[PDB]
Design an enzyme around this catalytic site. Structure first.
Site, mmCIF file in Angstrom:
data_model
loop_
_atom_site.group_PDB
_atom_site.id
_atom_site.type_symbol
_atom_site.label_atom_id
_atom_site.label_comp_id
_atom_site.label_asym_id
_atom_site.label_seq_id
_atom_site.Cartn_x
_atom_site.Cartn_y
_atom_site.Cartn_z
ATOM 1 N N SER A 42 37.225 32.341 54.684
ATOM 2 C CA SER A 42 36.705 33.267 53.593
ATOM 3 C C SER A 42 35.307 33.513 54.112
ATOM 4 O O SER A 42 34.543 32.296 54.602
ATOM 5 C CB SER A 42 36.968 33.230 52.196
ATOM 6 O OG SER A 42 36.308 31.747 51.915
ATOM 7 N N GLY A 43 34.769 34.448 53.818
ATOM 8 C CA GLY A 43 33.377 35.073 54.199
ATOM 9 C C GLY A 43 33.105 35.455 55.540
ATOM 10 O O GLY A 43 32.163 36.007 55.908
ATOM 11 N N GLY A 45 39.349 28.264 54.419
ATOM 12 C CA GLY A 45 38.187 27.812 55.243
ATOM 13 C C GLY A 45 37.814 29.289 55.950
ATOM 14 O O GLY A 45 36.651 29.010 56.722
ATOM 15 N N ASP A 75 33.184 41.187 46.263
ATOM 16 C CA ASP A 75 33.050 39.568 46.609
ATOM 17 C C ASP A 75 32.246 39.712 48.108
ATOM 18 O O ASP A 75 32.775 39.838 49.413
ATOM 19 C CB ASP A 75 34.611 39.211 47.192
ATOM 20 C CG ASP A 75 34.447 37.734 47.490
ATOM 21 O OD1 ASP A 75 33.434 37.079 47.337
ATOM 22 O OD2 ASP A 75 35.557 37.144 47.714
ATOM 23 N N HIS A 83 32.279 34.390 46.675
ATOM 24 C CA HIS A 83 33.250 33.277 45.943
ATOM 25 C C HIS A 83 32.843 31.834 46.799
ATOM 26 O O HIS A 83 33.086 30.884 46.102
ATOM 27 C CB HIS A 83 34.703 33.547 46.069
ATOM 28 C CG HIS A 83 35.268 33.537 47.309
ATOM 29 N ND1 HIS A 83 35.738 34.528 48.024
ATOM 30 C CD2 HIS A 83 35.692 32.399 48.158
ATOM 31 C CE1 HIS A 83 36.250 34.301 49.355
ATOM 32 N NE2 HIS A 83 36.104 32.990 49.224
HETATM 33 C C1 LIG Z 1 33.138 22.290 51.061
HETATM 34 C C2 LIG Z 1 33.506 23.195 49.829
HETATM 35 O O1 LIG Z 1 34.365 24.005 50.299
HETATM 36 C C3 LIG Z 1 35.103 24.605 49.212
HETATM 37 O O2 LIG Z 1 35.126 24.407 48.171
HETATM 38 C C4 LIG Z 1 35.814 26.095 49.855
HETATM 39 C C5 LIG Z 1 35.072 27.498 49.409
HETATM 40 C C6 LIG Z 1 35.646 28.572 49.499
HETATM 41 C C7 LIG Z 1 36.975 28.722 48.354
HETATM 42 C C8 LIG Z 1 37.815 29.894 48.894
HETATM 43 C C9 LIG Z 1 38.546 29.476 50.300
HETATM 44 N N1 LIG Z 1 39.636 30.683 50.506
HETATM 45 C C10 LIG Z 1 39.702 31.114 52.046
HETATM 46 O O3 LIG Z 1 38.914 30.541 53.059
HETATM 47 C C11 LIG Z 1 40.734 32.210 52.162
HETATM 48 C C12 LIG Z 1 41.598 32.573 51.519
HETATM 49 C C13 LIG Z 1 42.475 33.836 52.017
HETATM 50 C C14 LIG Z 1 42.075 34.696 52.515
HETATM 51 C C15 LIG Z 1 42.970 35.984 52.808
HETATM 52 CL CL1 LIG Z 1 42.084 37.407 53.327
HETATM 53 C C16 LIG Z 1 44.027 35.651 52.825
HETATM 54 C C17 LIG Z 1 44.732 34.590 52.036
HETATM 55 C C18 LIG Z 1 43.863 33.602 51.643
HETATM 56 N N2 LIG Z 1 44.399 32.476 51.140
HETATM 57 C C19 LIG Z 1 45.650 32.147 50.126
HETATM 58 N N3 LIG Z 1 45.875 31.083 50.198
HETATM 59 N N4 LIG Z 1 44.914 30.231 51.000
HETATM 60 N N5 LIG Z 1 44.146 31.111 51.775
HETATM 61 C C20 LIG Z 1 39.030 28.302 50.289
HETATM 62 C C21 LIG Z 1 38.494 27.247 51.169
HETATM 63 C C22 LIG Z 1 39.040 25.855 51.047
HETATM 64 C C23 LIG Z 1 39.761 25.770 50.273
HETATM 65 C C24 LIG Z 1 40.475 26.598 49.622
HETATM 66 N N6 LIG Z 1 40.313 28.151 49.522
HETATM 67 C C25 LIG Z 1 38.185 25.098 51.644
HETATM 68 C C26 LIG Z 1 38.924 23.925 52.587
HETATM 69 C C27 LIG Z 1 38.155 23.100 53.258
HETATM 70 C C28 LIG Z 1 36.899 23.186 53.744
HETATM 71 N N7 LIG Z 1 36.100 22.211 54.422
HETATM 72 C C29 LIG Z 1 36.400 20.990 54.742
HETATM 73 O O4 LIG Z 1 37.516 20.578 54.606
HETATM 74 O O5 LIG Z 1 35.495 20.590 55.556
HETATM 75 C C30 LIG Z 1 35.953 19.328 56.357
HETATM 76 C C31 LIG Z 1 36.262 24.203 52.981
HETATM 77 C C32 LIG Z 1 36.661 25.117 51.996
HETATM 78 N N8 LIG Z 1 36.095 25.978 51.343
#
Ligand SMILES: CCOC(=O)[C@H]1CCCC[C@H](NC(=O)/C=C/c2cc(Cl)ccc2-n2cnnn2)c2cc(ccn2)-c2ccc(NC(=O)OC)cc2N1
Length: 238
Positions: free
Chosen positions: A188-189, A186, A93, A44
């Site tokens: 995930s992965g 942030g 995933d 993802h």
């Molecule tokens: C740079 C672009 O990056 C992006 O678009 C995403 C790409 C990945 C998308 C899915 C990811 N989910 C998880 O990381 C975890 C989920 C999770 C896992 C478990 Cl086991 C339990 C509950 C969970 N959650 C429920 N609600 N929250 N977590 C996620 C990550 C971001 C936002 C939203 N969701 C995100 C926010 C900031 C930055 N960078 C930044 O600000 O740099 C300065 C990068 C990203 N990455």
């Protein structure tokens, strides 16, 4: 990571931070070193990533402040997404990144063992989730890699917690019934690393959950032992 604490340098040497340079450089996802040109992460992460040319893999990092324009990184030659993957909540995933160059192993960067066929029956009691993700729903990427110790939850219990989802045996859940410690945005992965017989195993890949560290909402992870044949198919291709 919610409810975690700062990691010590070299504690999780398979942990990487994957950055995107588009539109500006920022942390995208966590990942794990599993081989000298291979990172295992979540499919993802690559939503809307049109090319591996925009990715940078940083290993041997404790603090995101160590990353500047002059910091060495690994380029990505190829992104391999499981071809049954549709979305995190439906499973599969999992993704591999083939690096452009080889990782030289040392005390700051080395691979984590994948689980064995026999490890499908073992009960892991020392599991940790790590990452630079949010400490709460509305937060920011953390400078210091965080860690949290979390118990594994059975498939039957995880299914009861996620009415309306299908929790398969290709997923593994983790978290306290009362909440408080979990992965968050942030993270995930990144790895769910479990120590068994003094050896760390990559048991899960941080995938999804309903909110962060909520009571009776365990985190859902890709169950790595169920994908060992897929990983070997892609990394050991003739
Ligand atoms: C740079 C672009 O990056 C992006 O678009 C995403 C790409 C990945 C998308 C899915 C990811 N989910 C998880 O990381 C975890 C989920 C999770 C896992 C478990 Cl086991 C339990 C509950 C969970 N959650 C429920 N609600 N929250 N977590 C996620 C990550 C971001 C936002 C939203 N969701 C995100 C926010 C900031 C930055 N960078 C930044 O600000 O740099 C300065 C990068 C990203 N990455």
């Amino acid at each position: 990571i919610v409810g975690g604490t700062a990691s010590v340098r070299g504690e999780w040497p398979w942990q990487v931070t994957l950055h995107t340079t588009s539109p500006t450089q920022r942390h995208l996802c966590g990942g794990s070193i599993i081989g000298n040109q291979w990172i295992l992460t979540a499919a993802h992460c690559f939503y809307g990533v049109e090319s591996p040319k925009i990715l940078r893999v940083y290993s041997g990092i404790l603090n995101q402040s160590e990353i500047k324009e002059d910091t060495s990184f690994f380029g990505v030659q190829e992104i391999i997404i499981h071809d049954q993957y549709k979305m995190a909540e439906s499973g599969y995933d999992i993704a591999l990144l083939k690096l452009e160059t080889t990782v030289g192993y040392g005390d700051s960067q080395r691979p984590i063992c994948l689980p064995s066929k026999g490890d499908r029956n073992v009960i892991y009691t020392d599991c940790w989730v790590t990452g630079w993700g949010y400490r709460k729903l509305r937060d920011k990427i953390q400078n210091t890699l965080q860690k949290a110790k979390i118990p594994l939850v059975t498939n039957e219990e995880c299914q009861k917690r996620y009415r309306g989802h299908k929790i398969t045996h290709k997923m593994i859940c983790a978290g306290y019934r009362e909440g408080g410690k979990d992965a968050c945005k942030g993270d995930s992965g990144g790895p769910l690393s479990c120590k068994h017989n003094e050896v760390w195993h990559l048991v899960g890949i941080t995938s999804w959950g309903e909110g962060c560290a909520q009571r009776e909402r365990p985190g859902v992870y890709t169950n790595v032992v169920e994908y060992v044949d897929w990983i070997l198919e892609k990394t050991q291709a003739v």
